[PDB]
Design an enzyme around this catalytic site. Structure first.
Site, PDB file in Angstrom:
ATOM      1  N   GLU A  50       2.696  -4.318 -14.292  1.00  0.00           N
ATOM      2  CA  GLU A  50       2.202  -2.897 -13.552  1.00  0.00           C
ATOM      3  C   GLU A  50       3.207  -1.836 -14.128  1.00  0.00           C
ATOM      4  O   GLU A  50       4.479  -1.907 -14.219  1.00  0.00           O
ATOM      5  CB  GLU A  50       2.622  -2.993 -12.309  1.00  0.00           C
ATOM      6  CG  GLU A  50       1.492  -3.803 -11.403  1.00  0.00           C
ATOM      7  CD  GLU A  50       1.837  -3.462  -9.858  1.00  0.00           C
ATOM      8  OE1 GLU A  50       2.774  -3.172  -9.362  1.00  0.00           O
ATOM      9  OE2 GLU A  50       0.923  -3.924  -8.961  1.00  0.00           O
ATOM     10  N   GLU A  58       6.944   6.583  -0.265  1.00  0.00           N
ATOM     11  CA  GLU A  58       7.445   6.129  -1.499  1.00  0.00           C
ATOM     12  C   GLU A  58       8.997   6.021  -1.274  1.00  0.00           C
ATOM     13  O   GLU A  58       9.627   6.763  -1.004  1.00  0.00           O
ATOM     14  CB  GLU A  58       7.072   7.324  -2.445  1.00  0.00           C
ATOM     15  CG  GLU A  58       7.414   6.781  -3.871  1.00  0.00           C
ATOM     16  CD  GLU A  58       6.148   5.583  -4.404  1.00  0.00           C
ATOM     17  OE1 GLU A  58       6.099   4.523  -3.817  1.00  0.00           O
ATOM     18  OE2 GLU A  58       5.620   6.040  -5.537  1.00  0.00           O
TER      19      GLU A  58
END
Length: 262
Positions: A50, A58
């Site tokens: 990723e 977040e």
């Protein structure tokens, strides 16, 4: 017409192995280290990479990582170029780009889609793209054969799961936002029973032990921030972040694979 993701998930299933997918931010802590980190992670047992597209929006760990990367003016084209550099010696390992919708839209949906595939990107994880707004992106992504990795949670609605079970390819990203392991297991298995694609746990994996405990029942694990911290702490301590990140991921790879033994 097969994606790298599907080929990789098949070889994992045949080898009775679970997926181990690390996340790093492109350009963190500096650009010249990213591709080297990507190879090191694959070398240490990463099945799927990723790669984060830096954006200012977040957890605090990922937030600080993107800030560090944005200081080097890392943008979409730079991320794609790093993928190209990576693909010069690695054409097998699936690369997933993770990021926000805004930088991609400013880049141009169709232009980004073809450039990503050309660079060697296999799929995207768009964190702020709800299924109700994903019709346009899904069509463009499908044209160039770019996979859309959808997110789901314990509370993902029935209508959403229906949409996801049709338009999603590869695998699903499982999130759940004082949670303990037994409660996680129950909630995960409940969601997995409603998913066609394999369900990958993408939060809370900080240690080799935890990675192994989750991989006991999960289709795979995603390392969300543990590697970011390992890299930046090694870098701040004037040590080698390549060895540090590798050692951490190897430990997880081994712990996961040792499941079933005595």
């Amino acid at each position: 017409a097969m994606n790298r993701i599907d080929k990789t998930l098949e070889k994992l299933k045949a080898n009775r192995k679970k997926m181990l997918s690390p996340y790093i931010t492109a350009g963190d802590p500096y650009p010249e280290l990213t591709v080297s980190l990507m190879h090191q992670l694959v070398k240490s047992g990463a099945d799927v990479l990723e790669l984060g597209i830096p954006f200012s929006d977040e957890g605090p760990v990922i937030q600080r990582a993107m800030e560090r990367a944005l200081a080097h003016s890392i943008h979409c084209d730079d991320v794609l170029n790093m993928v190209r550099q990576f693909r010069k010696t690695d054409t097998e390992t699936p690369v997933i780009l993770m990021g926000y919708l805004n930088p991609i839209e400013q880049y141009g949906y169709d232009l980004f889609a073809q450039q990503a595939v050309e660079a060697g990107v296999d799929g995207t994880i768009l964190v702020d793209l709800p299924p109700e707004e994903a019709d346009g992106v899904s069509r463009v992504w499908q044209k160039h054969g770019l996979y859309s990795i959808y997110l789901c949670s314990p509370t993902t609605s029935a209508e959403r799961m229906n949409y996801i079970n049709q338009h999603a390819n590869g695998y699903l990203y499982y999130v759940s936002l004082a949670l303990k392991l037994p409660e996680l297991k129950a909630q995960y298995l409940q969601r997995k029973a409603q998913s066609k694609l394999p369900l990958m746990v993408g939060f809370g994996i900080k240690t080799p032990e935890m990675a192994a405990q989750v991989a006991e029942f999960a289709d795979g694990v995603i390392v969300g921030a543990a590697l970011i911290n390992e890299i930046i702490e090694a870098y701040e301590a004037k040590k080698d972040p390549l060895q540090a990140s590798g050692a951490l991921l190897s430990s997880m790879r081994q712990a996961i694979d040792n499941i079933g033994s005595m």
